Task: inverse folding
């Protein structure tokens, strides 16, 4: 089985649960799963405990990741009910701003309850820096409206339904600056699989779609800018427990599933590289990684087991699905980081890419005229 060399892939939506939920995952275990999945750079989400919604929590998370991460990273800041206008000094050091717009009681929304709060953030957050929004169903149209009123771009996370992707398609057709990502469980899992998973294992936000939803995503792959795992590791105790948190662990399964689709002719290799490397780079202004690449074997057929080796979630919703292709070797900045069942760079090898000279988002100087 001869190998294919790819650049280092980028997963822009990962929940790594450190600080505060390290029994579900930490930086060291999460970045190990990332490397086993062909991913050499990740963007970790801010719904940590304490949440990353202030400069002190960001400084803490940044150094915990510098000491724990095995691959390179950037950290998101979280929009709060209170921090609009307070993040200007540290904004450039984050991956971007995350707005959580789920319509339910949860401390992932960090108090964001009102469209007026969204506007305050779109107006105070530096215009040259990225904003991503968790928005489901009609909320996507709402956030797009806020972006146009403030005349700036927005990135829509885990698009999962026909109505969402057709609305994004209409916005793009009118020249609006919007991009979006789709997660693997929304392209390969459906309502058909909720019987097997159950309401406990199968809870995820955005929830699994119907066959028509999944069908519309594949039909409109041209509208999708990025693939991202939405890696949301919860232990199986918590997924089956009383109040089950939403989220699937998918860092280790993302590439095997997509390479299977490439082997079946459902999308090209180029299409995959646009969505796991080039577009993540340009949307979040992520720098290249020197001497970094991934070798994959496209011929090895296998079945997804009950749990993948490296995530502490210790379960996967893709169990039993047959996949073609495997990650064989990852080289990260000159060093062998992974080979065929074992990660070989220690915790702390990863670096914060926003501290690289090439990793800052370019901006006009302060003394530039108003225009
Ligand atoms: Zn989300
Ligand atoms: Zn998420």
Result:
């Amino acid at each position: 089985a001869k190998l294919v060399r790819l650049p280092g892939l980028i997963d822009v939506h990962v929940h790594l649960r450190e600080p505060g939920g390290t029994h579900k995952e930490d930086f060291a275990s999460g970045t190990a799963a990332a490397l086993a999945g062909g991913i050499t750079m990740v963007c970790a989400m801010p719904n940590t405990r304490p949440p990353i919604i202030d400069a002190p929590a960001l400084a803490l998370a940044q150094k915990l990741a510098e000491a724990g991460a095995r691959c390179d990273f950037a950290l998101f800041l979280g929009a709060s009910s209170e921090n609009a206008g307070t993040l200007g000094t540290v904004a450039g050091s984050a991956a971007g701003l995350k707005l959580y717009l789920a319509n339910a009681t949860t401390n992932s929304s960090h108090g964001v309850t009102s469209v007026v709060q969204w506007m305050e953030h779109f107006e105070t957050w530096p215009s040259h820096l990225p904003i991503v929004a968790h928005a489901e169903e009609q909320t996507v149209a709402a956030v797009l409206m806020v972006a146009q009123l403030t005349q700036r771009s927005v990135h829509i996370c885990h698009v999962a339904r026909k109505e969402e992707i057709l609305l994004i398609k209409a916005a793009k057709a009118r020249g609006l600056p919007v991009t979006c990502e789709v997660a693997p469980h929304h392209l390969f899992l459906s309502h058909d699989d909720l019987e097997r998973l159950g309401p406990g294992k199968g809870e995820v936000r955005p929830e699994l779609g119907s066959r028509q939803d999944v069908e519309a995503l594949w039909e409109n792959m041209a509208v999708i800018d990025c693939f991202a795992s939405d890696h949301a590791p919860h232990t199986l105790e918590e997924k089956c427990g009383s109040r089950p948190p939403p989220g699937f662990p998918g860092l280790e399964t993302m590439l095997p599933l997509l390479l299977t689709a490439v082997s079946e002719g459902r999308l090209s290799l180029d299409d995959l590289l646009q969505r796991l490397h080039h577009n993540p780079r340009r949307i979040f202004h992520l720098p290249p990684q020197e001497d970094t690449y991934v070798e994959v074997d496209l011929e090895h057929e296998w079945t997804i087991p009950s749990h993948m080796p490296f995530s502490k979630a210790h379960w996967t919703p893709f169990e039993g699905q047959k996949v073609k292709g495997t990650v064989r070797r990852v080289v990260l900045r000159g060093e062998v980081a992974y080979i065929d069942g074992q990660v070989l760079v220690p915790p702390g090898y990863g670096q914060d890419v926003r501290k690289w000279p090439q990793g800052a988002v370019p901006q006009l100087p302060p003394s530039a005229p108003a225009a």
User: Anything to note?
Assistant: Residues 50 and 198 are 31 Å apart (CA to CA). DSSP finds eleven helices and 13 strands in the chain. The first strand starts at residue 3 and ends at 7.
